[model samples]
Target: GSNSGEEAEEWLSSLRAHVVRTGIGRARAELFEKQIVQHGGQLCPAQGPGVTHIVVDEGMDYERALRLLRLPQLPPGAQLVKSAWLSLCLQERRLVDVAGFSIFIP
Candidate 1:
């Protein structure tokens, strides 16, 4: 259930590269926000150059969600992911290997 404890830390270090921001549904944001910080990610107050990825609610209306916000000038390679992805990573105590939760660009 673990990597060589050393390898686990190494794996997690790479996974922690992003500065995360939350667009998770109200029901889940508070909890996930705490988890993000606990897992060595910074919780960004706004999305901008420093924001590397956004964790959003799976249940949100995809189109409107983008409309309410400016959706402007995201740093290159910045991406969106399902909130569950963060929960899964937290449970595994390492970054998930699957691109399973990526928000589709289409």
Candidate 2:
């Protein structure tokens, strides 16, 4: 975890594992970035890394908006999924596919 070659490799391997989880196959970082940009560009999502969740809007908040990803609403008769979980009911037209559930982005 230090600034050594070993650390770099370990981080790379961890990133690789995350990529696999996102259904992205093996590739270099540059390729990953390029592919993301090429494919309509991603948005501000907190998805693991080196993989594309591809957010639609960059939003005005940039930094905060970049970090704030919301989840879908709970089903009827369902209680709060977790404490402080956010609910989004945006009047604007768009797709809501960021976090899992009850988290909202502004």
Candidate 3:
């Protein structure tokens, strides 16, 4: 008897169910988009429907991110997170918890 199944393990598989949008710079956004896609996450080109997560740069306040993205408000139930969260996810090769990486107070 032997272990027969060889399954490819994707650490970022959890991201596959999330719809991500970014409010960072073009260069950084592009890099993040690539990583998100590579890790099986969906990217929203603009802040439209089905945006589950919004990634912003460090020290960016909620108002600043909204203004930068030209949005009146973030979509309901969407998480406002720092880009560092994505960075950590890539570093750990998994979708790490978003406890400290959240930008919003709530």
Best by TM-score: 3
- lDDT winner between 2 and 3, please give it: 3
Go through the candidates in order and give each one's C-alpha lDDT.
Answer: 0.53, 0.26, 0.60
The Cα error of candidate 2 at residue 30, in Å, is: 4.0
Predicted model with the maximum lDDT: 3
Clashing pairs in 3: none
Clashes of each: 0, 6, 0
- Could you tell me which 10 consecutive residues in candidate 1 have the lowest summed lDDT? 12-21
lDDT of 3 by residue, 1-106 (tens): 8854533354555553222334355565548767765665556634444655667765567566666656667666666677777777777777566667876765
Clashing pairs in 1: none
Whole-model lDDT for model 2 versus the true structure?
0.26
Candidate 2: list runs displaced more than 4 Å: 1-27, 47-106
* Global Cα RMSD, each model: 6.7, 15.4, 6.5
Candidate numbers sorted by TM-score from highest down: 3, 1, 2
Q: Between 1 and 2, whose TM-score is larger? A: 1
Ranking by lDDT: 3, 1, 2
Q: Give the 10-residue window scoring lowest on summed lDDT in candidate 3.
A: 15-24
How well does candidate 3 match the true structure in TM-score terms? 0.62
lDDT of 3 at 98: 66
